[PDB]
Amino acid sequence: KVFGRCELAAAMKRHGLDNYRGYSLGNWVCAAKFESNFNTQATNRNTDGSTDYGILQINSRWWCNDGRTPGSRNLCNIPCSALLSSDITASVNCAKKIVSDGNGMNAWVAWRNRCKGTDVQAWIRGCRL
Ligand SMILES: Nc1cccc(O)c1
Ligand SMILES: Nc1cccc(O)c1
Ligand SMILES: [Cl-]
Ligand SMILES: [Cl-]
Ligand SMILES: [Cl-]
Ligand SMILES: [Cl-]
Ligand SMILES: [Cl-]
Ligand code: NA
Ligand code: NA
């Protein structure tokens, strides 16, 4: 599914991301935009052989099982394919674990490089929430 901006903001709010661990909604929308272009089916192989999955590009080295990342863990205890659904529940639930792991949203390199320090509220302007 390719979400619209506001459509995603609303879905993320319904799933509890707004101000989760202190991160306002626009942080999550901005991160999704630059991670996946708002596409739940995005997959991208990393240099270490892991793959990133879904709207928040969650990585198989640590977070999910894809059966092809030797020596990895599955800390969200989910198949990586769950993270590609049109329903964002699994991605949101795993993102909550990731952002609680000690480095906050810095776990998403794109957030750190593209959203942190910027006016992220822009990403939810205009939306019915
Ligand atoms: N050593 C190790 C670490 C994680 C996963 C596995 O299958 C092996
Ligand atoms: N100093 C500064 C300004 C905006 C956001 C942030 O994370 C830090
Ligand atoms: Cl957009
Ligand atoms: Cl694996
Ligand atoms: Cl959804
Ligand atoms: Cl934090
Ligand atoms: Cl915001
Ligand atoms: Na804020
Ligand atoms: Na894994």
From Swiss-Prot:
One GO biological process term: killing of cells of another organism
Alphabetic keyword roster: Allergen, Antimicrobial, Bacteriolytic enzyme, Disulfide bond, Glycosidase, Hydrolase, Secreted, Signal
Superkingdom field: Eukaryota
Paired cysteines (S-S): C6-C127, C30-C115, C64-C80, C76-C94
GO molecular function, one term: lysozyme activity
Family matches, as SMART domains: LYZ1
Pfam families registered for this protein in UniProt: Lys (PF00062)
Top enzyme category: hydrolase
Location relative to the cell: Secreted
Gene3D superfamilies per record: 1.10.530.10
EC number(s) reported in the record: 3.2.1.17
Domain C-type lysozyme: 1-129
InterPro entries reported in the protein's UniProt record: Glyco_hydro_22, Glyco_hydro_22_CS, Glyco_hydro_22_lys, Lysozyme-like_dom_sf
Reactions mediated catalytically: Hydrolysis of (1->4)-beta-linkages between N-acetylmuramic acid and N-acetyl-D-glucosamine residues in a peptidoglycan and between N-acetyl-D-glucosamine residues in chitodextrins
Binding positions for substrate per the UniProt entry: D101
Miscellaneous remark of the record: Lysozyme C is capable of both hydrolysis and transglycosylation; it also shows a slight esterase activity. It acts rapidly on both peptide-substituted and unsubstituted peptidoglycan, and slowly on chitin oligosaccharides.
Known partners and oligomeric status: Monomer.
UniProt-recorded name of the protein: Lysozyme C
Source lineage: Eukaryota, Metazoa, Chordata, Craniata, Vertebrata
